């Protein structure tokens, strides 16, 4: 009953099971630990970062090793459009003979790989199960390096100080230039040297790379300035990927669009992209001042940025010390940027597939988009939660105020009511009218008169599609016109490739849109606005409100303030995160439902099914869920089973976890404490069991813990059931 | 970089004078015990108790390897594979083309014998109050003192004799595995070569 929460003496003195539960959930909140200083905080965070990167590299190495050992990578190379990639083998003693037979792939039961790693590794120039093994070996070596570094930087003479940790200019210069630019430069080097010849049949391994010229002229044009030579003779339109037939000699080109065979971006396009990004980031990494008297001091930049007329208060004067001294502000900024970035990855890796033969891998396309959108929602909610935490525990009004006037951040708490009221107005506006149009379509179609539907053509979005060259909406605007200056400017660089790809019905590049797209985009906007409303309200109201003008004194996460003053359930800022998690899950569900139904109709060919039935709710319920759930639920029946049996089991498992979350959310404490007391009496008053007694007094889960557990069940069930549905439906419908 | 100190003066390494002399074995033992208590206090890790137990097991296993070689040579060690219909799909190793290669029955029998011996060990582990030599160290008990580079030359059924023979057997197993890995033959093939041919005859 002691010594487990070593970091908290208050918990270690708890005589109940709450100590164990809270010991888990407070282990990473280093700022709240006993005998805590800032130096130890930054050093522990640094070591934890090292361990985390080691974990990531070990996970990647495991994926590589299991593809190399139990996969069919080599067979998939020779026939990427017919051979289904294998993730890893299965050894489960609970299998019957039927399950073994159904999951049997080649030599052993195995799982199909939906991560798209086969296409990614094939694109970057891997052709052998020994290339994957080398990658796994190297990644385990890197993990060992990172673990050694993490141990080393906790040693006495190697523990960095607060000044080093808060040295913003040095870290920015190095991160930008070194990390981004130099990693892009090295990736361009690999892309060219290995990937470009490997796509043309020439093997460039760790033996013949110092003697195989990536370009026939060989670094002469680069130093000579004749950089056009690297773009001459690109890959033809009859080039077979991985073979020298119809190949070229160029290494950096503009082509635009996709490879005619793999239906993916040109490797020479991506090498040029990464070279340009490398140059730009290396240049941008010299901005801030270091030991050589030139550069920028960001404190001065922030302080000097006050509009002269005066509408942002005193400007950004106090922001430097605010961000530097708070790890939650930086964490929130990083999480918001990462969420936007992974939303970008999801939205671009389906419209512009970058890996060979990934466009025809429909289950992996759906899985990748869903995975990245869910990660995006999680990251955004985390960014807002950490902003709220910064408000609660790191924000100092004195730093952000100069002689009564407030800086740009402190002024966000002055018109907080205006911000929240207008977020509420936008949410109500969008919800009222999107639901009104959807229900109008529902009722009108149900009454057998679909012509009375309200169908709004998304002209604004179709205008953008025409601006990028789509000649489908008869707009003749910028790139849909051959005479506009936008078209004449790039008529010789990348329009022929771009136009040939955007004006193609088999791509996902700028999918044609209609009224259903309009309505679902408005639903998405409503979801985004409502999630933002909840999170922003929790962040701004974190330090106090009218119901609790001292909420900052109770911390970020506390159960309530009691039944007084009318009742104060879910009044903390943590509860705002807890409520906004449901809205994030709902919004990501809407986004992924829209994407998956649109792409299922596109792949099956019945795009008229979406364009007609997507305007009313029953259309969704009947033609997406009810229609495509048939292959999934018949993964096992009283007659047999298929390789989709695991997905049906996961479907039911997700439903069960969802409803257990419903348990933990609807039923609150107090009802579970008295029942536990009855159980305690029963155990204490029964023979043959009195010999065994608990060391920690069994008590009901706390209010905040119960909310967390219900949210965890809700989210896990949500994710599992939707993953099972999307994967099984795609597999069982599209062969 | 220049206007500040990367490492504070208050956080600097101090040379541990407590390990002066203290040959690498003593230094390693002290470092392990200080760094990992509650597993060192149990006798686990680089400890004389663990060394003695592992030596006993290595000697018994040299005996077991000789017995296994004899059984393989003398027509024992049942033939074929396990019945998947009888023992489920967990005994299936691979399916090449329409035939299920299962775990060899000889491997199953050897695993059952090893299970017998390991069960005996587990009973002795959860029988601490009735066994002559316990597996772990009692709280308070102190680990027997390391024997050193060369244990005392005391012939017979002595602690030093068992200690020396356990070290020799463990080194022999290490050498056997190293020879098998370097040259590439089976473990029993290496033992057969190292016995002239008198085992697999």
């Amino acid at each position: 009953v002691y010594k487990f929460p070593k970091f908290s003496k208050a918990l270690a003195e708890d005589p109940s099971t709450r100590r164990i539960w809270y010991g888990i959930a407070t282990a990473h909140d280093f700022e709240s630990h006993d005998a805590m200083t800032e130096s130890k905080l930054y050093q522990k965070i640094f070591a934890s970062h090292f361990g985390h990167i080691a974990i990531i590299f070990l996970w990647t190495a495991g994926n590589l090793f299991h593809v190399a050992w139990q996969g069919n990578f080599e067979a998939w190379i020779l026939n990427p459009l017919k051979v289904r990639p294998i993730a890893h083998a299965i050894w489960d003693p609970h299998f019957g003979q039927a399950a073994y037979k159904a999951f049997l792939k080649t030599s052993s039961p195995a799982n199909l790989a939906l991560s798209g790693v086969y296409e990614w590794w094939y694109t970057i120039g891997m052709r052998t199960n020994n290339d994957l093994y080398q990658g796994s070996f190297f990644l385990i070596l890197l993990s060992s390096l990172l673990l050694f570094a993490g141990w080393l930087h906790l040693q006495p003479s190697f523990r960095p100080s607060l000044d080093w940790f808060k040295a913003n200019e040095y870290r920015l210069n190095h991160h930008l230039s070194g990390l981004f630019g130099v990693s892009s430069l090295a990736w361009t080097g690999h892309l060219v040297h290995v990937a470009i010849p490997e796509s043309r049949g020439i093997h460039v391994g760790w033996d013949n790379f110092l003697t195989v010229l990536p370009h026939p002229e060989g670094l002469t044009p680069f130093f000579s300035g004749n950089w056009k030579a690297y773009a001459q003779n690109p890959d033809t339109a009859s080039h077979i990927f991985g073979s020298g037939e119809g190949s070229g000699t160029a290494i950096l080109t503009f082509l635009g669009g996709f490879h005619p065979q793999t239906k993916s971006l040109w490797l020479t396009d991506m090498a040029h992209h990464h070279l340009a990004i490398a140059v730009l980031f290396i240049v941008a990494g010299h901005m801030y001042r270091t030991n050589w008297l030139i550069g920028h001091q960001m404190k001065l930049i922030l302080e000097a940025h006050r509009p002269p007329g005066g509408r942002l208060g005193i400007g950004h004067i106090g922001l430097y010390e605010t961000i530097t001294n708070s790890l939650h502000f930086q964490l929130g900024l990083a999480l918001a940027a990462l969420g936007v970035a992974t939303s970008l990855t999801a939205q671009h890796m389906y419209a512009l597939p970058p890996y060979a033969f990934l466009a025809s891998n429909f289950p992996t396309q759906a899985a990748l988009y869903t995975h990245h959108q869910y990660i995006a929602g999680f990251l955004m909610v985390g960014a807002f939660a950490h902003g709220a935490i910064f408000f609660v525990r790191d924000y100092d009004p004195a730093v952000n105020t100069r002689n009564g006037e407030k800086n740009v951040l402190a002024r966000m708490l002055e018109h907080k009511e205006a911000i929240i009221s207008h977020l509420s107005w936008v949410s109500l506006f969008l919800g009222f009218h999107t639901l009104g149009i959807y229900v109008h379509n529902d009722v009108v179609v149900a009454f057998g008169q679909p012509e009375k539907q309200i169908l709004v053509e998304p002209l604004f979005a179709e205008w953008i599609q025409a601006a990028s060259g789509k000649t489908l909406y008869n707009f003749d605007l910028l790139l849909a016109s051959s005479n506009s200056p936008a078209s004449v400017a790039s008529s010789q660089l990348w329009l022929p490739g771009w136009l040939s790809a955007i004006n193609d019905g088999k791509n996902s590049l700028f999918l044609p849109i209609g009224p259903g797209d309009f309505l679902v985009h408005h639903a998405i906007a409503l979801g985004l606005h409502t999630t933002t409303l909840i999170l922003v309200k929790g962040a701004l109201d974190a330090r106090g409100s009218k119901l609790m003008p001292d909420k900052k004194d109770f911390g970020y996460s506390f159960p309530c303030d009691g039944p007084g003053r009318g009742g104060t359930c879910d009044i903390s800022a943590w509860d705002a995160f807890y409520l906004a998690m449901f809205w994030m899950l709902n919004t990501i569900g809407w986004v992924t439902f829209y994407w998956h139904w649109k792409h299922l109709t596109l792949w099956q060919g019945n795009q008229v099914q979406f364009n007609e039935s997507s305007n009313y709710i029953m259309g969704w319920l009947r033609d997406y869920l009810w229609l495509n759930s048939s292959p999934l639920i018949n993964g096992y029946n009283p007659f047999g089973m298929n390789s989709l049996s695991v997905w049906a089991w996961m479907f039911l498992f997700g439903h069960l976890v969802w409803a257990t979350g419903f348990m933990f959310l609807i039923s609150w404490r107090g009802y579970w404490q008295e029942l536990i007391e009855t159980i305690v009496w029963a155990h204490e008053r029964t023979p043959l069991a009195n010999l065994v007694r608990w060391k920690d007094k069994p008590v009901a889960l706390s209010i905040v813990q119960a909310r967390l557990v219900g949210l965890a069940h809700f989210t896990i069930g949500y994710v599992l059931t939707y993953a099972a549905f999307v994967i099984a439906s795609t597999i069982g419908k599209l062969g | 970089g220049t206007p500040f100190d990367t490492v504070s003066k208050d956080e600097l390494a101090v040379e541990n004078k407590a390990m002066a002399g203290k040959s690498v074995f003593e230094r390693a033992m002290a470092d392990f015990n200080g760094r990992y208590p509650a597993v060192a206090a149990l006798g686990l890790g680089p400890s004389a108790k663990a060394e003695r137990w592992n030596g006993r097991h290595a000697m018994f296993g040299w005996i077991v390897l000789l017995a296994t070689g004899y059984a393989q040579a003398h027509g024992l060690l049942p033939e074929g594979g396990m019945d998947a219909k009888e023992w489920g799909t967990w005994v299936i190793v691979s399916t090449t083309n329409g035939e299920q290669v299962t775990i060899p029955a000889a491997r199953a029998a050897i695993a059952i014998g090893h299970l017998h011996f390991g069960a005996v060990g587990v009973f002795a582990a959860y029988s601490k109050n009735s066994v002559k030599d316990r597996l772990l160290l009692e709280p308070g008990e102190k680990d027997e003192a390391p024997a050193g580079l060369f244990p005392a030359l005391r012939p017979g059924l002595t602690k030093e004799a068992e200690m020396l023979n356990g070290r020799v057997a463990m080194l022999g197993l290490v050498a056997l595995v190293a020879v098998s890995a370097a040259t590439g033959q089976d473990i029993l093939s290496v033992i057969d070569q190292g016995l002239g041919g008198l085992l697999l005859k």
């Binding site: 361990g51 093994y133 070996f137 385990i140 060992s144 673990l147 141990w151 | 760094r35 990992y36």
Partner: peptide, 30 residues
Amino acid sequence: MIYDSQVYIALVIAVVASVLAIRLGATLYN
């Protein structure tokens, strides 16, 4: 198909990465 030697040494290297992980884990304290 990878050999027994390839998998074995990868397992051995994985063990070394495990001992480095507990050293980091124990250094981040109990």
